[PDB]
């Protein structure tokens, strides 16, 4: 009941017009600010108690950001485009020790997004679904978040089938990239925690705050 994909697409268009690891971390810190503005534009997100808004973002920021630069890089050959305007090529990632996870992003996310021509509306919805994760520990009212998630995918499915009537399996194909996103998201965090432990690699304040407990 009330969760128009037009509002979601708008949130998307509204937020987005040497060591490659360092550059990636600087980009992630920069996008963390933009992510907050994005969520605020997602219907009913702001109407939730501040405590739960914090929980949802702290729980999904990584998948949310990974989905964004992945969809943004669909045009690029073998690399991804950072929000800062810099490009990280596959070879560059490999030469810095993060080749395996970088390849997983290109293979499981970017490639697949390109093969099906996932549009901005679809991306927006998928991120909205990730944002509205009812499994987030600590939620004051999980059922309420669960209800919002269902309205997003209800609207998303309607969008599909009407926009891509000739692809009856599109809706399912979209949701089926979520397990991959979750997996890649967890691996990216492990690397990040390790980078912090090792000491090298500058980590800005917003990114660092995301690495705080719990």
């Amino acid at each position: 009941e009330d969760m128009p994909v037009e509002r979601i697409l708008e949130a998307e268009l509204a937020v987005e017009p040497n060591d490659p690891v360092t550059n990636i971390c600087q980009a992630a810190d920069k996008q963390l600010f933009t992510l907050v503005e994005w969520a605020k534009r997602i219907p009913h997100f702001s109407e939730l108690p501040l405590d739960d808004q914090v929980i949802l973002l702290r729980a999904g920021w990584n998948e949310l950001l990974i989905a964004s630069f992945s969809h943004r890089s669909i045009a690029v050959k073998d690399g991804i485009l950072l929000a800062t305007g810099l490009h990280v090529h596959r070879n560059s990632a490999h030469s810095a020790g993060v080749g395996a996870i970088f390849d997983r992003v290109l293979t499981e996310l970017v490639s697949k997004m390109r093969d099906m021509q996932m549009d901005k509306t679809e991306l927006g919805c998928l991120r909205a679904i990730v944002l509205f994760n009812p499994d987030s520990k600590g939620l004051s009212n999980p059922a309420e978040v669960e209800a919002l998630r269902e309205k997003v995918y209800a609207s998303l499915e309607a969008y599909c089938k009407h926009k891509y009537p000739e692809q009856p399996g599109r809706f399912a194909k979209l949701l089926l990239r979520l397990p991959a996103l979750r997996s890649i998201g967890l691996k990216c965090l492990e690397h990040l925690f390790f980078f912090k432990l090792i000491g090298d690699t500058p980590i800005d304040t917003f990114l660092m705050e995301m690495l705080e407990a719990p």
Partner: peptide
């Protein structure tokens, strides 16, 4: 905890 995030959401 989570100082920055809170400040951003409230504004």
């Amino acid at each position: 905890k989570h100082k920055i995030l809170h400040r951003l959401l409230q504004d």
